[PDB]
């Protein structure tokens, strides 16, 4: 769940909930998961600084777009409103040859599967996107997706209590988080997280508490993430 | 006062630099037209005076939002030297002319930030 650049995400049968969308989203369930990664580049440079055109394949030697270095591979796309760039966007894939570009425009918003053919005379490795992009005389891109296996429940350990649970009880729980929705990319280019793998505990708006290093059964230290109230004692 | 963009120093930059070409041509005829080209405007060559006017301050106003926009890296500067013979006062007015050198001359092309640029105009107008 580390990849190298940024890109689209969109999960198939995953349902989630969720209270707020700055703080991640906690799932409930388990399913598949698409990524669909493009590289961006949120700039505010002009038309004359950049060297490349619209829809230039590029290398990974020295990658240079608007005088500055680039780390991915792919068919580059700019941005242009009011005479000054807004986003470099490279779509990474490789680039076959191929004809007819009235039949490649459907094929956009379809999922391609490896057992199928894109075209006829031109085969596919694993599965992809296809892609049409307006280059000067003229093939149409096959952009890769990247699946990955989640959990409906992490391995979590067995909790050990020593009280009489009368009122007050504390627990620990591990549960995973998603960042990103289907209907959103992510603004960037260099390695972005997922998921979180975190440990949320929940008290059944006060009572703060104060863990510590604390151990007696080996020569080591182990976590107590316990909860007291100081009493005072005169020195008289 | 609201600060600037990304995409609003381009904008404004382009207009003080047709500002730059249009005093230009001032300064190139003020030699020949007896030191008063009040009415000669070279550019056009009732709707083209009028045109030539709304121009003309839409290319001074642009040049007034770039610096007055832009105090707040004055401040940021000025403060590091409120020690040794000046007053906080007398060093925020002297960095703002460093910031009105620093606006004529910025170049939009090179792709470089004003706020990089600047800082080596407001810095040696206070030193």
């Not at chain 1, 700055?22 to 409930?28: A, H, I, N, S």
Request: one cysteine or more; charged letters at 30%.
């Amino acid at each position: 769940y580390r990849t190298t650049t940024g890109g689209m995400i969109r999960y198939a049968g995953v349902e989630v909930a969720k209270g707020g969308r700055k703080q991640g989203y906690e799932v409930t369930k388990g399913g598949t998961l698409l990524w669909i990664p493009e590289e961006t580049h949120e700039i505010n440079k002009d038309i004359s600084l950049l060297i490349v055109e619209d829809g230039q394949y590029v290398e990974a030697g020295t990658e240079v777009v608007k005088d500055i270095f680039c780390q991915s591979s792919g068919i580059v796309e700019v941005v242009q409103k009011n005479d000054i760039l807004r986003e470099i966007i490279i779509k990474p894939g490789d680039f076959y040859q191929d004809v007819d570009p009235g039949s490649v425009k459907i094929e956009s918003g379809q999922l391609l599967q490896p057992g199928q053919d894109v075209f006829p005379g031109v085969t596919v490795s694993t599965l992809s996107q296809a892609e049409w992009i307006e280059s000067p005389e003229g093939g149409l891109l096959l952009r890769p997706v990247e699946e990955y296996k989640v959990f409906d429940e992490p391995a979590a350990p067995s909790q050990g209590s020593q009280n009489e649970e009368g009122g007050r009880q504390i627990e620990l729980r591990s549960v995973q988080r998603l960042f990103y929705k289907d209907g959103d990319r992510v603004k960037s280019v260099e390695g972005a997280p997922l998921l979180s793998t975190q440990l949320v505990l929940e008290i059944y708006h006060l009572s703060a508490d104060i863990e510590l290093q604390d151990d007696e059964e080996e020569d080591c230290q182990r976590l107590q993430l316990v909860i007291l109230e100081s009493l005072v004692l005169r020195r008289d | 006062i609201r600060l600037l963009r990304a995409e609003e120093e381009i904008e404004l930059a382009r207009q003080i630099a047709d500002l730059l070409e249009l005093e230009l041509i001032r300064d190139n005829l003020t030699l020949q037209l007896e030191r008063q080209p009040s009415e000669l405007e070279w550019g056009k060559q009732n709707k083209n005076f009028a045109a030539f006017r709304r121009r003309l301050f839409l290319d001074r106003r642009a040049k007034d939002k770039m610096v007055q926009s832009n105090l707040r890296l004055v401040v940021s500067i000025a403060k590091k030297y409120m020690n040794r013979g000046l007053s906080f006062q007398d060093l925020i007015q002297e960095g703002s002319l460093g910031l009105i050198r620093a606006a004529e001359k910025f170049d939009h092309e090179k792709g470089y930030k004003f706020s990089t640029y600047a800082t080596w105009w407001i810095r040696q107008a206070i030193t």
